[PDB]
Design a protein around this nucleic acid. Sequence first.
RNA 1: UGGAGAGUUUGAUCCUGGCUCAGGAUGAACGCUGGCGGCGUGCCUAAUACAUGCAAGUCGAGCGA
Length: 154
Amino acid sequence: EFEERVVTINRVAKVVKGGRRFRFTALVVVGDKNGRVGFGTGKAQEVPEAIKKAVEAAKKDLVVVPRVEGTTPHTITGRYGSGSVFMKPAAPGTGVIAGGPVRAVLELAGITDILSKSLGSNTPINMVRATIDGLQNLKNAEDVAKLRGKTVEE
RNA sequence: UGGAGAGUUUGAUCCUGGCUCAGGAUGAACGCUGGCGGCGUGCCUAAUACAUGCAAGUCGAGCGA
């Protein structure tokens, strides 16, 4: 079993052309607090029924994040399109600071670090796709120790 | 050692982009209420004429009288 949160919903369609559409949508992040997250988007006109379509879209996506049990291994500027968050490791004891779309993703991988703010992000969709693009590009020491010498560098 | 955001142009979007709020401050004023032990700081606006008080004397083993 997993955990989900409703980040945002909308009421997006064209009102009357002779026949009405007025649909909703959602952007649900799912996670397990072990290091695997995801996100997906569905749409329907009955209000909480598009969430079950949205959690359906995110269970088929898992992203493995390295961890030193509380923070991230290094720093990176997770960038996608027009969004850019900044993330950097803390010391164990300080909690995850906000960025609300970026706040709820970092708690469902299971860390307690600082989070620098969204630099150029505007809307809560590209905050999410810039968050996940940051998390899926970190590096361990062991995989680096594969294609180098064997843990010399300290 | 340590670094958050939200709102608003469209029938509905993504972007550029402004304006606006939450917070910390004051040798502040002013608004309501009033128990203090104790610690500090109280002409920042007309350089607008300054009553009354005290702030530079001491030495009688200088020397006169």
